[PDB]
Amino acid sequence: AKRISILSRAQSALNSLPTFQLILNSNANQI
Amino acid sequence: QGTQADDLVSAIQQNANHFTELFCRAIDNNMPLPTKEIDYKDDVLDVILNQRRLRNERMLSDRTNEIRSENLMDTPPSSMNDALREVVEDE
């Protein structure tokens, strides 16, 4: 995301990017 | 000539220690390329610094190649050229 964000605001015309949250889903067996 | 210039001499005479690295940085921004080639009669410090510069150039080129090969957005050439230079230089 850091290298996506740098190529984002300098092209589609300070910024701090926090640590991204891991969210995960699944459709496996529900015990 | 009529233009305005700051008193660089007094600033050096009062705070010379900072201006040492300021002048070294200014020299490093404007460094002519070596006209003669490196040889076996050169200093060991010279070959170490030459290898360090070449390694820096190769690291920058390899990171440029990897970021260009990833193709994050698949999309103004100078725009993503400058942006990719920035992301390589701070990566």
Swiss-Prot record, chain A:
Localization of this protein: Nucleus
Function: Acts as a component of the MCM2-7 complex (MCM complex) which is the putative replicative helicase essential for 'once per cell cycle' DNA replication initiation and elongation in eukaryotic cells. The active ATPase sites in the MCM2-7 ring are formed through the interaction surfaces of two neighboring subunits such that a critical structure of a conserved arginine finger motif is provided in trans relative to the ATP-binding site of the Walker A box of the adjacent subunit.
Subunit description: Component of the MCM2-7 complex. The complex forms a toroidal hexameric ring with the proposed subunit order MCM2-MCM6-MCM4-MCM7-MCM3-MCM5; loaded onto DNA, forms a head-head double hexamer. Interacts with CSM1.
Additional record remark: Present with 10300 molecules/cell in log phase SD medium. Early fractionation of eukaryotic MCM proteins yielded a variety of dimeric, trimeric and tetrameric complexes with unclear biological significance. The MCM2-7 hexamer is the proposed physiological active complex.
Protein family (similarity comment): Belongs to the MCM family.
The name this protein goes by in its record: Minichromosome maintenance protein 5
Organism: Saccharomyces cerevisiae (strain ATCC 204508 / S288c)
UniProtKB/Swiss-Prot annotation, chain B:
Places the protein is found: Cytoplasm; Nucleus
Domain of life assignment: Eukaryota
Subunit and partners: Component of the MCM2-7 complex. The complex forms a toroidal hexameric ring with the proposed subunit order MCM2-MCM6-MCM4-MCM7-MCM3-MCM5; loaded onto DNA, forms a head-head double hexamer. Interacts with CSM1 and MCM10.
Family statement: Belongs to the MCM family.
Further information: Present with 166 molecules/cell in log phase SD medium.
Biological role stated in the UniProt entry: Acts as a component of the MCM2-7 complex (MCM complex) which is the putative replicative helicase essential for 'once per cell cycle' DNA replication initiation and elongation in eukaryotic cells. Core component of CDC45-MCM-GINS (CMG) helicase, the molecular machine that unwinds template DNA during replication, and around which the replisome is built.
The protein's name in its UniProt record: DNA replication licensing factor MCM7
Native source organism of the sequence: Saccharomyces cerevisiae (strain ATCC 204508 / S288c) (Baker's yeast)
Parent-protein start and end of this portion: 95 to 188 of 845
